[PDB]
Amino acid sequence: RTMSENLRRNLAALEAKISEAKTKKNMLQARAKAAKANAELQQTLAAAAAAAAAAA
């Protein structure tokens, strides 16, 4: 009955950080989608400038 208190505190301290991780992943997946949308835009703008139809 000293071990069982020690385990019972450790068990609460785990789920307390499953809650923290699960709120962070939402914010990180949001950022990952935004970053990838801007990458495709900047790639498109560069390809258009490489064709230089206005100079032709």
């Binding site: 991780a21 962070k24 992943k25 990180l28 950022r31 990952a32 935004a34 970053a35 990838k36 801007n38 990458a39 835009l41 900047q42 703008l45």
Partner: protein, 49 residues
């Protein structure tokens, strides 16, 4: 989780750096001004009617 958070932050900073730097340059930096169109004189003349 800690290792995969750091990849996300590297993607984000790479994307923002290029877009911020592409925000410079005369053609863009003037495109943000409302009267940039160059027809302000004939608009003022039309406003005489």
């Amino acid at each position: 989780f800690e290792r995969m958070e750091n990849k996300v932050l590297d993607m984000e900073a790479t994307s923002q750096a290029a877009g911020e730097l592409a925000g410079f340059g005369i053609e863009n930096q003037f495109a943000q001004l409302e009267a940039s169109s160059g027809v302000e004189d004939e608009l003022a003349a039309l406003k005489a009617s």
